[PDB]
Amino acid sequence: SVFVGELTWKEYEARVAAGDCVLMLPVGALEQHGHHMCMNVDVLLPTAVCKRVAERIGALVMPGLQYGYKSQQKSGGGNHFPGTTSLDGATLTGTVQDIIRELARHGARRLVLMNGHYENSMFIVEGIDLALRELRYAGIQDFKVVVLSYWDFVKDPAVIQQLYPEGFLGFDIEHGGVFETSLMLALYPDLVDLDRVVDHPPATFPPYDVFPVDPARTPAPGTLSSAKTASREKGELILEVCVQGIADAIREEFPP
Amino acid sequence: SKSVFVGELTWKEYEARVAAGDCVLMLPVGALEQHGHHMCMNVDVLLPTAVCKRVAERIGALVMPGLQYGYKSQQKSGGGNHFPGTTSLDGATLTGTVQDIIRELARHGARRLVLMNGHYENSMFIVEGIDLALRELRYAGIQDFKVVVLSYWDFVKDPAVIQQLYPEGFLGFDIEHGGVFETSLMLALYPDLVDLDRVVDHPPATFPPYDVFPVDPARTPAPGTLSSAKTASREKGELILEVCVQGIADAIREEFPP
Amino acid sequence: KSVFVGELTWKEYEARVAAGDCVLMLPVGALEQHGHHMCMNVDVLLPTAVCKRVAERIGALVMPGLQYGYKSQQKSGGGNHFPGTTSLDGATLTGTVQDIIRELARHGARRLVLMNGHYENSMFIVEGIDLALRELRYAGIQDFKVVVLSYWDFVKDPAVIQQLYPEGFLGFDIEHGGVFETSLMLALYPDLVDLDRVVDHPPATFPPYDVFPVDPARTPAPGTLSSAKTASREKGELILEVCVQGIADAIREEFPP
Amino acid sequence: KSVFVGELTWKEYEARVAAGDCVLMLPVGALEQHGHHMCMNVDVLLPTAVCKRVAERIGALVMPGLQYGYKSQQKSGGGNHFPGTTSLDGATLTGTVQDIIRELARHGARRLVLMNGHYENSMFIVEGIDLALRELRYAGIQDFKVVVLSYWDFVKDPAVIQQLYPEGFLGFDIEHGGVFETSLMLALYPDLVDLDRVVDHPPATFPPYDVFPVDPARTPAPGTLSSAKTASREKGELILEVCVQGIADAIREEFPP
Amino acid sequence: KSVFVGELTWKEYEARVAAGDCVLMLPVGALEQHGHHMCMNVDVLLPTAVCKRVAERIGALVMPGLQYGYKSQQKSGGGNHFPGTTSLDGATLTGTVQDIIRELARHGARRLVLMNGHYENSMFIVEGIDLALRELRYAGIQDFKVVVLSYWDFVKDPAVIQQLYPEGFLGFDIEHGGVFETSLMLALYPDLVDLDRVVDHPPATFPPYDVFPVDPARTPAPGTLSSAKTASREKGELILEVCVQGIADAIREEFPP
Amino acid sequence: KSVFVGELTWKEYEARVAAGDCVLMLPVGALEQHGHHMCMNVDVLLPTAVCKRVAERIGALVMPGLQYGYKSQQKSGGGNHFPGTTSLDGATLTGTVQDIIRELARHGARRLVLMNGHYENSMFIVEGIDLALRELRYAGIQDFKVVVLSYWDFVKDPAVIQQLYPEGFLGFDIEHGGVFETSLMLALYPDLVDLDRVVDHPPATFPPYDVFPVDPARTPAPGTLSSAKTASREKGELILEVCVQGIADAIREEFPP
Numbered sequence A: 001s002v003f004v005g006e007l008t009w010k011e012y013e014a015r016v017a018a019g020d021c022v023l024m025l026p027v028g029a030l031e032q033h034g035h036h037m038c039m040n041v042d043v044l045l046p047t048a049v050c051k052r053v054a055e056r057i058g059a060l061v062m063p064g065l066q067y068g069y070k071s072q073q074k075s076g077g078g079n080h081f082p083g084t085t086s087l088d089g090a091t092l093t094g095t096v097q098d099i100i101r102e103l104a105r106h107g108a109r110r111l112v113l114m115n116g117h118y119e120n121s122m123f124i125v126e127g128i129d130l131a132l133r134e135l136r137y138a139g140i141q142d143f144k145v146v147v148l149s150y151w152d153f154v155k156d157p158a159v160i161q162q163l164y165p166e167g168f169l170g171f172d173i174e175h176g177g178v179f180e181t182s183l184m185l186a187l188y189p190d191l192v193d194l195d196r197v198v199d200h201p202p203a204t205f206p207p208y209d210v211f212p213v214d215p216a217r218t219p220a221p222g223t224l225s226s227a228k229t230a231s232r233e234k235g236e237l238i239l240e241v242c243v244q245g246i247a248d249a250i251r252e253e254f255p256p
Numbered sequence B: 001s002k003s004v005f006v007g008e009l010t011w012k013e014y015e016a017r018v019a020a021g022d023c024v025l026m027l028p029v030g031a032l033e034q035h036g037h038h039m040c041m042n043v044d045v046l047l048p049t050a051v052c053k054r055v056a057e058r059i060g061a062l063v064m065p066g067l068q069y070g071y072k073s074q075q076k077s078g079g080g081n082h083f084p085g086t087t088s089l090d091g092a093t094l095t096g097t098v099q100d101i102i103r104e105l106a107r108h109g110a111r112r113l114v115l116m117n118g119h120y121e122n123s124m125f126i127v128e129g130i131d132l133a134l135r136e137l138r139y140a141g142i143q144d145f146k147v148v149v150l151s152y153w154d155f156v157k158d159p160a161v162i163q164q165l166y167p168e169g170f171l172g173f174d175i176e177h178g179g180v181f182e183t184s185l186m187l188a189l190y191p192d193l194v195d196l197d198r199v200v201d202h203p204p205a206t207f208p209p210y211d212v213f214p215v216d217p218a219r220t221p222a223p224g225t226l227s228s229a230k231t232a233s234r235e236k237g238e239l240i241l242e243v244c245v246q247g248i249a250d251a252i253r254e255e256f257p258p
Numbered sequence C, D, E, F: 001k002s003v004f005v006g007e008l009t010w011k012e013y014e015a016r017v018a019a020g021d022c023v024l025m026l027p028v029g030a031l032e033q034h035g036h037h038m039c040m041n042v043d044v045l046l047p048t049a050v051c052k053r054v055a056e057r058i059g060a061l062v063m064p065g066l067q068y069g070y071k072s073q074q075k076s077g078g079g080n081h082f083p084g085t086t087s088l089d090g091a092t093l094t095g096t097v098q099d100i101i102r103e104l105a106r107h108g109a110r111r112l113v114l115m116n117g118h119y120e121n122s123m124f125i126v127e128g129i130d131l132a133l134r135e136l137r138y139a140g141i142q143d144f145k146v147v148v149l150s151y152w153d154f155v156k157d158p159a160v161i162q163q164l165y166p167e168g169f170l171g172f173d174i175e176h177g178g179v180f181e182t183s184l185m186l187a188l189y190p191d192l193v194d195l196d197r198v199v200d201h202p203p204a205t206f207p208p209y210d211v212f213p214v215d216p217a218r219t220p221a222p223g224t225l226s227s228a229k230t231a232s233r234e235k236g237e238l239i240l241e242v243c244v245q246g247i248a249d250a251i252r253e254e255f256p257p
Ligand SMILES: C[As](C)(=O)[O-]
Pocket: A042, A075, A076, A116, A117, A118, A119, A174, A175, A176, A180
């Protein structure tokens, strides 16, 4: 297994003793994903990508962070939905910070943080900075971190044309939409019930945000766009592009 | 999709259950910690989650995603935080995570939570998280949120059971880290993650009535275990499991009446 | 007098708030390197200038701006390894925003517009808003409304973009010390800009990921992510009116008398 | 002059640490209800009394004891719903331990014995130690050693237990305001104990789980988890000498010349 | 049944608070060097003794005094570079005061007098009070009243000052280990003061600013900011009676039955 | 040519810092009510104005000033119950100071002058400095020197005070929106002062203790602690030149090349 949790400490130690061992940490969330999908999607997807990437380039995967930052209206629907269970920014930042400090203690020096929940980004970044600051204080400056959101590797125009034949509107409305639902159909079809999809128009917002979150500004089902056209085929295409692109980046940044 | 695991439900399935009136939520709290040469490191997550799954199925409760990282491993209970693999959180982080989740469950309208600890060292930080959350709920005007905290192993106290588990004599849960107790449960639940042939049959670990910091590696058995899992078995694991599941289910039934 | 709260007496401020529908605006910037051709307080000056004009036009008041913001990121601001750039930890920025909102609530104010001028500040401003609103709820206050925005997001009209980038627009992705900010500065503070020092280098391109610690080799030496060679006062005057008008209308919509 | 740092001049203290092998001891207690028969500062009085005697024997120094500890838990201290009990949040206690260690390290001290007298303090003292040691490591200090213990853990000899509980031993589990602490108080602070006020009730029994908010109905009315009726000055003297000798020996072992 | 909460059983404490108008007092001190002639716990001993006497006269209760305070400052306490002085970070002191106030409110207490004995503590005690009152408000409690004071502020009567300083008064700015505190200690804890060790150096003078890291050369070698050579037990008795009567009256005025 | 860091390019700043001996100055103020006759950003304006003139005379640079300070206290600034006054929690102000010093140390700067213009900021600035210096030590930096001061502390010459208060000097205790600040404002920002609104009430007098929640009845209605009726541009010019020369000399002495 490529999962750190499924190894003995001796097995883990041997791998880190190699000197060039790469570790990967999935950072997700428990967030509503419409009427047609489960709430652990943001954990499941990055974990699935990490698994395949780790198997492809010989890395190990740390247990994923199940809870992420508060859902935002324009990206996740809003934190007023039941089910969505979010952490305060400081909590997520401190979790990332503690994990990095511990990996450094192990002697590990290569980490790939793979985000699956849009809202986590800056808090992951702060956790990285704070940990690196402490490592410098501990006399460690050879620890390198690569952070990314897996969907950012799906930029190729040819690929996008295949996923959105009718036309591409952007990733702005991709919460529980075609993109995530397609991946789930390819990975965990038993957790997707396409017949429950509410085919509503794409959500649109002005160039500003309002707080407290106004429930009237998010589509009733919680999705920001319809997943009606999602398919296992699109999911497999997305999956291959992401696994391929990320494996390549890791090979470039963390050569053996 | 219908499941006891909240993560596998759509928000409507979850909302429907909470709207039911007296929904009980369970939250496994584990750790990523070394467990000798014979077992994997996510044992403290796997075990309380497996117990939660079975209890939930019997009493109709739901299980929240488990906390994968716990408080720093202590020499006398988990071998110590100097071992590789063990990845621990600072107390404030664990406390804050528990606090945040309770704040959110309350917002959802849930009012019944069972926190099932699988990592000894987590206890007091889970407790502080609960107290800080209940304090905020009170400020929010909520005083009917009830929390039950427990470590599944505490439900295995029946002398008859203890005798079956330790026919050679019981020394106590004191040295039960990667020992007979946890290993047997793993053999009954995740045999593939256990390799009894790698077990180091060393004598029970003993310590003086105090602790030393920085942690002294010499005071912990080399394998990381505090006792030998040499006599562990699937059969013992099955007895432990059923005992914990039946006992915990009854506890919830009494504390969270319909 | 002035729309700046700092330039009012406490009685004049009290009278404005007493009106019952007073709107307050808070610029949030940073002290950050902006190439060889511009000064480092750009992110404070610009949102403050926009706030000043929106506030005068719609009758709102402007709070003292936050001079320091979150750590500069490589892909948006060049990186926090640059000298001069002086950044706050996230908790610090979040706490300042949270504290100011708590105080405005105490004054009896209930309408706030947070105008970001530094890309990286966004989520920390958002957390400060959430933590403060959570407290107001505990205090029994649930009628406080906050609008948060980055002024550049109001410059989207295709026609406007065409006039600013007649050669083609490459997204605000590389707009750190580039045509957009420099043009605004040429229209507002020409004395703090010297186009003769602009380094006309091709726009910065990055892979779809980030590396830490920050690698200096991945940021154009000058600190800019794109060249401000084609910047001008006229372009700045256009950007300024589009922003002021747009934000002013957004406020009239969300905060009606 | 005195083993207590608080009663020393800074010169006397300095000279003692200047010796090079000075051992410091920090009592950590609490202000907590202790039934109808004893005062509320017991948790600090006891560890402080034990430290004093140990210090006088091995030549150590005793720091002012922490008067406020972590929240009282139902199964160990009755619960934090009792009046009088005044508890700190975990972070506060941890921060205090952490600050004291930092300061002692600054003094040049490198040997500390933390003696806990309030069960619930345990994990927060441990976290304070770790955070402090982490900082000391960053400061280039890695020769600072800490011994942490709860004085009652040194009373484990079967024979001694026999003289304390000749009627049978149930365990320290129910020892809150019971025979153990009450006996020590009778031998150390007899004027703070009115054994005639003891409410004789069966030992407290709890299911293998905890409930929050704490349910007052699950704690014996008086606040004690067991009866102190059989407590005596004689048992106190026995417990005391056993603890002092055991702890002095531990210190000699962990902090040799 | 004394005035010290720590020496009361929870039932006795509960009865006093149940009375309806119970006043609680909390001494806030420090462990700080006090020259060659006095022990280091002077800052907790003095306010505690004053509280004890005020409480016995007005019927109030005294909580365990805080033994550790904020970092000693050069111009007020000699500086935090001295051995012995063991200080808390500001967040720690603040949180301790906040936690205690929160707990007193839980008990049902609504009247508190915080008596400071360490100058540097003041602003952190103030923040602790504000943060706690903020939470009480969120909890629905708005009748909790707090009086904060440094016992020495009650000694400003010209006739009194003339008695204590017949050679001329220069102010309390240099009263660290000086005539004022030493005289009080001679009247309350003679065994902890060794006047024969006083260093009769001239009053410390400082420029109108401070330097960090603290410069040891700017503090008089002994640690004292003024000579306590003219300190006396008689002067201490005068200061004591003046403070006690003054504080006792203040409490009557602020907390009328 | 400007001495303000915000008005420099990062290249200009880098050159100055790398040149060595570069003294940075950070003004720390507040947004606080200053009576019926003056604006609320006085505490920012004054120290910033002093820094500018001092910097121009000794070759130092001035960082963007902190616009928000700690909570206004009744005896020094009227109280934090006034509208307009917008204050930070202590931790927030302390964290801001701490983050800035950390960053300046990263730039290679090693000399900093913190100029406070809001009385209540003092101790939180001090804690910010201590925490930052602690981290710098962990980073291997032990040559960073900080000077902290309140500009008014340089106005203590009898001849000067006699010239400013030709009717008896009572002290700076009642100096909040009084003759001192109002005079400085008349010499620097006359348009932000309207002496015709000055309320000529007697100086404020308070008992030797504080009360919380703050009691509005104990603060002069206008918010001023003393009357500024006798304020003048001439008195302001004298104060300004005295402070500028004094601070310039202090810096030359503490920060020689
Ligand atoms: C927009 As998303 C993948 O964080 O739900």
